[PDB]
Structures are given as structure tokens and as C-alpha cells.
A paper describes a structure:
Kinesins are a family of microtubule-based motors that play important roles in intracellular transport and cell division. Kinesin-1 transports cargo within cells, a process tightly coupled with ATP hydrolysis. Whereas kinesin-1 in solution is mostly loaded with ADP, ADP release is accelerated several thousand-fold upon microtubule binding. Here we characterized kinesin-1 P-loop mutations that interfere with ADP binding and determined the structure of the corresponding mutated nucleotide-free kinesins.
Author numbering: 7 to 238, 248 to 324
Write the structure that this text describes.
């Protein structure tokens, strides 16, 4: 199994401080967090004061290199609502300090590409879509609202009709993310409720061709901001279904099973060529350190434990 799991704790938020919550996360070394005297070991644990830069460097940087070598990959943000998933995945998009994983990935991709000599030709294209109530919508074309999953020649599942946009700079990709977030408001009355109950999926497809040696390489990287994992409606059941499917896929891979139940959900089907097999995966579980959220945090930590070999 190629899955790594890293746990990120955010600082206590304003409500938590005012309410008088206790900081219940205890840290041991760089890989362990202990809750109520019970330890949970991961590939890495980030404490509340961990910077965006360091999170990227541990969770994502190496996967970006693999994608530039022709690997596929997935990076997930998992955790209850307000645990810091979007701050981690997106952060402040145009801010060199505040930017999250996706902007740093894109920068790294282009930094490598523009440094290469004339023998290499690159084509970078991005897609951005969401899954809500078990329906796929293109965030770059809001007329595309119930996209189906299809399989190509080589039995590779794909989203039929999803917008694929060619990009040639990090600024252009950020502009694409900005447009997607704005488009996401279409037909949505409450964004907080919607975003907490849907999964957002950003895809970067990096194709390269050395015209001198006549070699081609292609790498796909999916960046997934999952629905909130909290136990707190048709929305709930759909969300339970999609995360439980991902859970079973992760456990199957962690067991070294040859059979992996990708078909358990649309999402895992979509990610089939970039999750398991020879693809690289990091799950970043996000948690509140507040005593008030102790039950959901334990649940999040136990979800992360699934990837343990």
C-alpha cells in the first residue's frame, strides 16, 4: 500500500476559546497524538502552530515529483466541518504564506516545467467538479449538473462531459479555482451547508513529451476536499455512503487485498486509476484540538487508522 496518513490539528477557534474549551491533544514525537491517554500513530502529526509550507512539504511535495515522473496520485482532506480542510487544501490562494496545498503543488509543477529545455513539450489541463447528493456537477460549467461516470477503452473510469481547461501558469490555475468557487454558488441558497455536505475534486493532468527521445509521460493528480465527517436528510445518507466507500477502499488496500471495492461509490470509481495500484496517496485528516469535539476527533483519528498496513 502506497497510502500515507498525516494528521493536522488547527488552533482553537474563537468560539472554542470563548466557550472555555480545553486543549485535549497531547503530542509525542513527530508521528503520534494521544487523546485521553490513548495514542494514535500516523506517518506525521502536525501541531496547531504548523505552517502551510511544512504541511505541503511533508504531505504533498513528493507526490508532485511522482506525478512529474508519470505516476498518478490522490490527496484527500478528511475531517469534521470547521476542522480546517479548506484552509489546508486551498488556504489563501494568492498569498505566499497563507496558500495551502493546491496552490503550492501548481507552483511546483510549473517551476519544474519552465526549467526544462526545448526537448520537452508539456500540456497541463485542469478539471474542477463536485459531488453532492450523489450527483456530479462541473464547477467550470454550471449547465453540466448530473454527469455520469463512464469507462474508456482500457477500462479507465472518467466523468463524461467534465470541463477540461488548458493552463500555462499558476495564476491561471488559481483563476480557475476562483471561478469554480464562485460558480459553486449557483443554485445554492446556503453555501456553508452545501460545502459541508459535498465533495470538491480538483484534477491536474500533466502530460509531457520528449520530442528528441520520443518518450511520453502522463500523470494525474486529484485533490479532494471531502464532505464533513461528523455524525450531525438525504444529504447525510449520501455522505455516509461516499465516505464509507472510501473507508472500505483504504482498508482493502491496507490489507494488501488484490480486490478493491472501487465500485462502492462514484467517487472511488472516478479515482480508480489514481488510488491504489501504483498510485500515491496522502490522506490529511484534519482535527480540532478542543475538548468539545473529542468524539468526532476520535472518529476522525480512527478513520485515518484504516490505512495502517
Amino acid at each position: 500500500s502506497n497510502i500515507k496518513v498525516m494528521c493536522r490539528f488547527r488552533p482553537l477557534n474563537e468560539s472554542e476559546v470563548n466557550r472555555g474549551d480545553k486543549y485535549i491533544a497531547k503530542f509525542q514525537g513527530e508521528d503520534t497524538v494521544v487523546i485521553a491517554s490513548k495514542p494514535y500513530a500516523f506517518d506525521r502529526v502536525f501541531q496547531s502552530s504548523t505552517s502551510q509550507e511544512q504541511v505541503y512539504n511533508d504531505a504533498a511535495k513528493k507526490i508532485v515529483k511522482d506525478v512529474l515522473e508519470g505516476y498518478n496520485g490522490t490527496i484527500f482532506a478528511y475531517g469534521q466541518t470547521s476542522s480546517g480542510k479548506v484552509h489546508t487544501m486551498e488556504g489563501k490562494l494568492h498569498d505566499p504564506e497563507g496558500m495551502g496545498i493546491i496552490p503550492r503543488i501548481v507552483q511546483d509543477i510549473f517551476n519544474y516545467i519552465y526549467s526544462m529545455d526545448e526537448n520537452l513539450e508539456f500540456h497541463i489541463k485542469v478539471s474542477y467538479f463536485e459531488i453532492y447528493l450523489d450527483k456530479i456537477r462541473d464547477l467550470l460549467d454550471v449547465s453540466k449538473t448530473n454527469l455520469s461516470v463512464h469507462e474508456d477503452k482500457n477500462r479507465v473510469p472518467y466523468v463524461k462531459g467534465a470541463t477540461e481547461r488548458f493552463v500555462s501558469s499558476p495564476d491561471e490555475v488559481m483563476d480557475t479555482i476562483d471561478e469554480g468557487k464562485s460558480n459553486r454558488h449557483v443554485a445554492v441558497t446556503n453555501m456553508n451547508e452545501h460545502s459541508s455536505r459535498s465533495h470538491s475534486i480538483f484534477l491536474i493532468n500533466v502530460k509531457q513529451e520528449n520530442t528528441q527521445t520520443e518518450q511520453k509521460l502522463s500523470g494525474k493528480l486529484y485533490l479532494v476536499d471531502l464532505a464533513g465527517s461528523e455524525k450531525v436528510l438525504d444529504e447525510a445518507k449520501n455522505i455516509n455512503k461516499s465516505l464509507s466507500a472510501l473507508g472500505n477502499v483504504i482498508s482493502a488496500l491496507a490489507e494488501g487485498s488484490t480486490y478493491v471495492p472501487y465500485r462502492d461509490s462514484k467517487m472511488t470509481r472516478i479515482l480508480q486509476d489514481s488510488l491504489g495500484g501504483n498510485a500515491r496517496t496522502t490522506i490529511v485528516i484534519c482535527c480540532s484540538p478542543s475538548s468539545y469535539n473529542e468524539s468526532e476527533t476520535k472518529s476522525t483519528l480512527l478513520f485515518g487508522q484504516r490505512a495502517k498496513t
